[PDB]
Amino acid sequence: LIVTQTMKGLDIQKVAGTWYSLAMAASDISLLDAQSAPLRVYVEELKPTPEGDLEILLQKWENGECAQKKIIAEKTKIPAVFKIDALNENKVLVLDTDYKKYLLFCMENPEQSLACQCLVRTPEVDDEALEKFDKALKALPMHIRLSFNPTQLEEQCHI
Amino acid sequence: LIVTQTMKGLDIQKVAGTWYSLAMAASDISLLDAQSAPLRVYVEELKPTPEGDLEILLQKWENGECAQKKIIAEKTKIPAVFKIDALNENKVLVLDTDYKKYLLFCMENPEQSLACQCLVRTPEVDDEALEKFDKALKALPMHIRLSFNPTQLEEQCHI
Ligand SMILES: CCCCCCCCCCCCCCCCCC(=O)O
Numbered sequence: 001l002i003v004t005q006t007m008k009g010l011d012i013q014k015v016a017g018t019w020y021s022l023a024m025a026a027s028d029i030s031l032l033d034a035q036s037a038p039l040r041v042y043v044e045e046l047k048p049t050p051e052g053d054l055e056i057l058l059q060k061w062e063n064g065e066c067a068q069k070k071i072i073a074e075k076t077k078i079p080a081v082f083k084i085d086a087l088n089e090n091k092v093l094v095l096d097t098d099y100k101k102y103l104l105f106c107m108e109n110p111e112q113s114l115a116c117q118c119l120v121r122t123p124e125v126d127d128e129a130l131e132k133f134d135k136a137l138k139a140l141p142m143h144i145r146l147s148f149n150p151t152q153l154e155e156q157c158h159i
Numbered sequence: 160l161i162v163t164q165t166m167k168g169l170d171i172q173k174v175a176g177t178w179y180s181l182a183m184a185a186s187d188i189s190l191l192d193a194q195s196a197p198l199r200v201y202v203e204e205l206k207p208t209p210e211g212d213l214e215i216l217l218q219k220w221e222n223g224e225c226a227q228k229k230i231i232a233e234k235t236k237i238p239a240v241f242k243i244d245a246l247n248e249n250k251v252l253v254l255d256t257d258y259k260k261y262l263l264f265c266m267e268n269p270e271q272s273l274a275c276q277c278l279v280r281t282p283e284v285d286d287e288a289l290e291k292f293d294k295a296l297k298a299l300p301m302h303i304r305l306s307f308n309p310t311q312l313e314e315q316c317h318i
């Protein structure tokens with residue numbers, strides 16, 4: 001409920017495939033801090049299920065290694081909002097997407113842990129999708145923001 | 160030379176006294192990463208010398224402790240640019256200040272390590288000085304940005 005923006009007319013099937021986590025932002029510094037921080041996650045691919053659920057493939061640093069992760073985001077009544085398994089059932093909200101270039105989403109559990117990403121289809125710095133990410137976030141109370149270069153985008157865990 | 164903005168008419172005496180590091184930004188993620196990161200420094204006070212040099216009091220996390228530091232920024236021909244001791248003689252540039260509320264500065268060694276801060280006089284979140292900080296930075300190639308709340312501002316090393 002903290003975020004006042006969701007996409008209308010979302011077709012979840014049409015977000016399937018490859019994405020890059022070009023920018024991330026969060027409400028608290030420590031959510032994004034180190035390579036091992038709790039919401040510091042690098043999206044690899046989205047697989048919508050026929051039921052309209054969302055399989056998410058991602059990377060996360062756990063040892064001093066970049067681990068492979070698989071998560072399922074379950075649908076709700078709202079086409080733009082999903083719930084994750086399971087500890088306090090984390091809500092994922094789709095704010096905006098053109099399916100073909102960018103997607104903006106936020107993850108939350110009006111209090112008040114929040115992380116958001118600007119996803120893009122290709123390993124390039126998209127200024128106008130970053131402008132849209134900054135435009136959507138200037139509302140929210142973010143205290144850390146990270147951006148990645150094309151080199152980092154083609155590496156595991158963006159080193 | 161990387162930054163295209165400095166303050167004209169700067170009187171270094173009139174920046175003396177108490178400041179808070181409200182926001183920081185940098186060109187590379189790892190410059191600001193953890194509590195121990197190289198340019199992650201919390202400004203406490205500025206003491207201009209009669210010669211027009213600048214004594215800087217600051218905090219930096221070195222052990223798992225917040226250490227007290229003292230540095231001297233030596234003047235140059237340009238009233239807005241100072242050089243620090245001594246390893247590669249780091250240039251500090253004053254971009255803008257109203258002496259009474261905010262100060263924007265950048266620290267650099269056109270390549271291409273760069274960190275900048277929005278300094279303010281009081282432990283409050285100044286939206287219009289943060290707007291000015293974001294306006295001055297949208298030029299520069301920053302990849303990490305951090306913001307602090309009034310609580311953090313009154314603690315050592317902003318915990
Ligand atoms: C549905 C359309 C957009 C989907 C975008 C992908 C959203 C990804 C949400 C992933 C959140 C996972 C939280 C962190 C889990 C990491 C596991 C861990 O805690 O170590």
Ligand SMILES: CCCCCCCCCCCCCCCCCC(=O)O
Pocket residue numbers: 174197198200202205213215219228230232241243251253264266
């Ligand atoms: C002169 C007007 C504005 C002055 C603003 C203060 C600028 C502070 C510059 C300090 C840069 C120090 C670099 C990091 C030093 C920390 C020591 C270390 O490496 O452990």
